[PDB]
Design a binder for these strands. Structure first.
Lengths: 173, 241, 366, 260, 165
DNA sequence: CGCGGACGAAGCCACCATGTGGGCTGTCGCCAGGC
DNA sequence: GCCTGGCGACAGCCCACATGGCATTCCACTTATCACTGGCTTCGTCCGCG
């Protein structure tokens, strides 16, 4: 359901990065920190209207908007897959190292909600840095469900990653 | 005549047809077991005539089918060779092989409410309240839920199984009513299994088959309880009235 | 007959013990995640400091054949006879044909499937047993499938020899159950008193030659670290340690040395990058006769925070020790030693000025 | 006359019992999986402890000797419920590696990599003693009296020996409640049919929840049951469990006194 | 903090009645924006932050212009409605809002009376009990309260723009 | 030389699926006058 | 005794800003290691111990 507010946030913000600089620059200074942190007080003008009503959903929305605006200029310039499908696409196509990125994904899958946020911006900006595609609404919904799921979303992330890597390798034959 | 027996608790096992190290349970209670539960409550020594128990009737509605789990269960391992399980010849086996390895199954998180209707069942209910030996759900290690007897005396208890006994939290659709519940009655017979206990003598326990017909019936959705802790509340409201 | 030692010890941004992915090991205890140091790690640090201080060292190795081969080679054997003789050492013992060996590696003697745990001079004695029978070994070295010629009883008697570490922590050998020794020490997993979220540190190893155009890091990653006040606990079953060593005097030195190692040692996990070396903030040795009791339930309710956890952890361990001595009455000889002087901590028994004075008093009391 | 005893004993990081694999035993109860310590394992330690302190009451309190042939009394009368955690518990994997002491021209080719499961929680224990049949079978009410008292102390003091050297799980129960009941034995297990939520601990909350369940059951069925409890906490009153006692052996003494 | 709110509401109606009924004690409260505040507000108290959180709001309430003096949303929504209804400038009242959200407990009491009296001057509704409690929760946790005001403010301003179209 | 313990002898069979939540608490203004 | 009312005088109004800006490259590792044990039958023979 949340995927709806998530898609509205992804659209408006995806337009916001390209058209108005002061807004995305007001968004990127809040990457990876809880909304109570004073560096986030400037991001409420953009994000606060779109969150329904647990902090888990707010942290998902606010954080993905911040990671979304912190894309490098090159990335910003240019079925529904998860972040794991985006990972496997960055392994097979863009040539990222395999033993390390699989290790980093199975490293994310153990954190709690507090830890995922700590680890995610570095990984996502790594992925985004080489034009890997990531559907932000799915990542939002997933990050909102990370709080109440012990591993119910992460397992989906890991399974899809391994599976998509196997299929991408078998299609190359 | 008749009374309501509620079989609940974290784990209960009602095995039938197993005679080796691996044990297996019927997903629903077995008459042999419940009859032995009453015999234990009345002080029936093993081997005593079980015909007093004959003529009872056990309609059992399954609230939660429960998860079936297999509990490992060794016997005697990790003991010096002299102190392990004896052999039939009498000479203890070597300690690396003296361990017994049973794989006993048990129903966990399952709750049934059997409505026992019989000729003296009211004295039996009065015996469960003050037992001769501890009643247990299948294996003695499983200890029954305190609401073992929901009502000591009820005229037509099956009428109370169809309605007016609370139920565990289940999906309740909008504009829904009459949530489906499986009643178990004793052509249209689900299975045939050796239940009716001819004798409980440990030397030669013997049984005979009983056909079971499981009829999904429709009880009002008002009966099911709210999501959390409400089941215990409605059930307790139920025991005083 | 039970000496149990409790200890509160803070570690600053250490990350001494890592899981398989590099994160510090955690317990979700009391409903709240708390970083922990596994018992086997601190136990390894304790056994190496005890062996280094008491002088006798035991060796847990999967490659016993190769080591016996160096001793036979220094005794004047040819390399091929040394290898065949060490294979005879492991081939001559056990129920089945011999101790099972891992798949053969090129140029090197095969490792045994299970980890042997025996003192060093006992390995040398195994070399001497394989040495006396040099001609029989030479004859079996010519056969395609040589059999265990060496006496099994002599070898099994060498493999039964116990180090202080074997006496203290016990050993296990599945093929030779005669050599198994019951451990005399229970070592608990050191967890934090308070809930700890895993702190991430982002480091970048810098390239040193300047690039002509694009200067960037040589490598960049993030390693997880954490800090906190750990609770530590351990038991020593005096009846089993006396049973293992045999004489009460070596058991006495083993216990005193163990307790001192328990206080002094640190697992050394990335210590070259964190310098987590620290002395415990509080130590409490009890000499109980009925049964050992860990005070870990005292810290099941995680501490809130914002203020230094040391004083509250010491005071909370005090209240739980008081409440247990009232609930479970006993004549156990207690005693403690603390850095802080802000509180008397009356329930932890007689106070001693120093850790060695406390260890000497409680060991002398047992 | 049935003497039953409930304990809320917590256990730190440990693996007291385990499956045919390495993972510990779990009941799925109240919809939330929860680790458990099986009844026979716990019973074995209690029986071994009773027979060691007591120096055939072990065939009477406990049904029969495992290594002896049946002596027409296989029933032990004593009933041991399987201990299970107050809350739901996820299995905690502990990855470990045994170190190779002999070093090759190689570093860290570790001796043995593996991963073993452990868990921690507050188990809600419970047992029953059929006093009357114990007196009728043992004969002397005095041997039975000493045996019953020592059995309760063994139930309290002991902890199973399983992976205990790698995890010093030795611990004392936080709450014990002995209720000499004449109607029938009852376990307060349904108090925890809804697993408690976390992050603030469970000892105290499980203590008052069990107090709420004792008030309600005592309300529906008022009985002549003699009760009393001892806790490691003085902060909260639990009037429904009976008169509080200063300690565990004093409590056991008052309830053994109450049975006869 | 639910218990802080009950006393805030009882103090609010007591002080409101005292402000309209007696000018002597009300002027005795307006001077602080101090013994008279101690003899008036003191009974309605359950940390120095909660007391200042009471005396400051009672003095601010007593300093209203008689237009506002004769006549549950918090202060972020009170500023949003003050923007939407009275036409009060949004770009500037937003800056005064973020400037309030940065201060600590002694500074929030330095910048609050000016903006609040400016709200009352425009007859915008201010739920005095919640503002009191929020100032009391401010010594306990500042960032949560400040963010709540900012988010609510920008959020209810947007909703009122959807209602406009 | 006798007894007890341990080991050995087989027969052995293999393109795509997931949604939930709600229960605990207390307070003044004081004094004087009139009913 | 209880309930209700009262205790010099303590101000009012008006006012609240516009505009502009919000960065960009680069870089993301290797190696080695990965347990055992058992939970069949009866009998006979051999070896060890007394």
């Amino acid at each position: 359901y949340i995927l709806q507010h998530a898609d509205a946030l992804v659209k408006r913000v995806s337009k916001l990065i390209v058209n108005e600089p002061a807004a995305r620059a007001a968004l990127r200074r809040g990457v990876g920190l809880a909304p109570e942190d004073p560096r986030m007080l400037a991001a409420h003008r953009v994000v606060a209207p779109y969150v329904p009503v647990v902090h888990a959903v707010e942290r998902a929305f606010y954080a993905v908007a911040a990671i979304m605006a912190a894309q490098p200029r090159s990335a910003r310039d240019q079925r529904r897959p998860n972040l794991g499908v985006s990972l496997a696409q960055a392994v097979f196509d863009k040539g990222l190292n395999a033993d390390s990125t699989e290790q980093r994904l199975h490293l994310i899958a153990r954190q709690n909600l507090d830890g995922v946020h700590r680890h995610l911006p570095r990984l996502v900006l790594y992925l985004r840095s080489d034009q890997v595609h990531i559907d932000w609404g799915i990542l939002i919904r997933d990050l909102a469900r990370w709080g109440h799921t012990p591993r119910h979303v992460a397992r989906e992330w890991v399974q899809d990653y391994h599976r998509t890597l196997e299929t991408l390798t078998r299609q190359a034959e | 005549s008749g009374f309501l027996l509620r079989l609940a608790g974290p784990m209960q096992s009602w095995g039938e047809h197993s005679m080796f190290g691996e044990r297996d349970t019927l997903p629903y209670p077995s008459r042999s077991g419940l009859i032995g539960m009453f015999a234990a409550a009345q002080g029936v020594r093993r081997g005593d005539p079980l015909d007093r128990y004959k003529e009872l009737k056990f309609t059992v509605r399954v609230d939660r089918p429960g998860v079936r789990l297999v509990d490992f269960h060794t016997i005697g391992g990790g003991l010096p060779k002299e102190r392990t399980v004896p052999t039939a010849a009498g000479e203890r086996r070597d300690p690396k092989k003296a361990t017994i390895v049973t794989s006993r199954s048990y129903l966990a998180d399952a709750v049934f409410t059997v409505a026992v209707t019989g000729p003296e069942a009211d004295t039996i209910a009065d015996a469960l309240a003050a037992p001769y030996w501890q009643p247990y759900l299948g294996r003695r290690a499983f200890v029954p839920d305190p609401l073992l007897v929901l009502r000591r005396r009820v005229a037509d208890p099956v009428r109370e199984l169809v309605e007016a006994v609370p139920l565990p939290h289940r999906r309740v659709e909008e504009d829904a009513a009459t949530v489906l519940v499986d009643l178990i009655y004793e052509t249209r017979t689900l299975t045939v299994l050796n239940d009716v206990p001819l004798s409980f003598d440990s030397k030669s326990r013997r049984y005979s088959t009983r056909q079971i017909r499981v009829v999904p019936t429709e009880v009002p959705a008002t009966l099911v309880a709210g999501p959390g802790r409400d089941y215990q509340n409605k059930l307790f409201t139920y025991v005083k009235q | 007959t039970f000496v149990d030692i409790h200890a509160i010890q803070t570690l600053p941004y250490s990350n001494i013990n890592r899981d398989d992915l590099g994160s510090p090991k955690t317990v979700v205890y009391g409903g709240k995640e708390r970083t922990r140091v596994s018992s086997q790690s601190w136990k390894r640090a304790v056994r190496h400091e005890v062996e280094a201080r008491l002088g006798d060292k035991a060796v847990r190795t999967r490659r016993i054949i190769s080591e016996i081969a160096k001793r036979l080679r220094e005794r004047g054997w040819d390399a091929d006879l040394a290898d065949a003789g060490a294979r005879q050492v492991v081939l001559s013992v056990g129920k089945k044909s011999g101790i099972k060996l891992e798949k053969e590696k090129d140029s090197e003697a095969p490792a045994t499937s299970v980890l042997f745990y025996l003192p060093v001079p006992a390995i040398d004695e195994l070399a001497a047993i394989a040495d006396e029978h040099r001609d029989a070994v030479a004859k079996e070295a010519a056969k395609k499938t040589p059999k265990g010629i060496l006496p099994a009883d002599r070898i099994t008697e060498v493999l039964k020899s116990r180090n202080v570490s074997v006496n203290l922590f016990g050993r296990m050998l599945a093929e030779l159950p005669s050599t198994e020794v019951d451990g005399a020490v229970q070592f608990a997993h050191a967890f934090t008193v308070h809930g700890t979220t895993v702190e991430v540190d982002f480091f970048t190893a810098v390239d040193d030659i300047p690039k002509e155009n694009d200067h960037g890091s040589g490598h960049m990653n993030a390693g997880q670290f954490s800090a906190g006040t750990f609770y530590r606990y351990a038991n020593v079953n005096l009846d089993r340690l006396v049973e293992n060593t045999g004489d009460a005097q070596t058991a006495r030195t083993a216990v005193a040395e163990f307790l001192r190692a328990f206080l002094s040692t640190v697992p050394s996990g990335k210590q070259n990058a964190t310098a987590a070396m620290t002395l415990p903030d509080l130590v409490h040795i009890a000499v109980r006769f009925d049964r050992p009791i860990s005070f870990a339930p005292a810290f099941e309710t995680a501490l809130y925070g914002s203020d230094g956890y040391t004083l509250r952890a010491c005071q909370e361990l005090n209240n739980y020790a008081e409440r247990l001595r009232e609930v479970w009455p006993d004549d156990a000889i207690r005693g403690y030693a603390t850095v802080e002087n802000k509180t008397d901590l009356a329930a932890l028994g007689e106070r001693y000025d120093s850790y060695p004075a406390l260890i000497d008093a409680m060991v002398a009391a047992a």
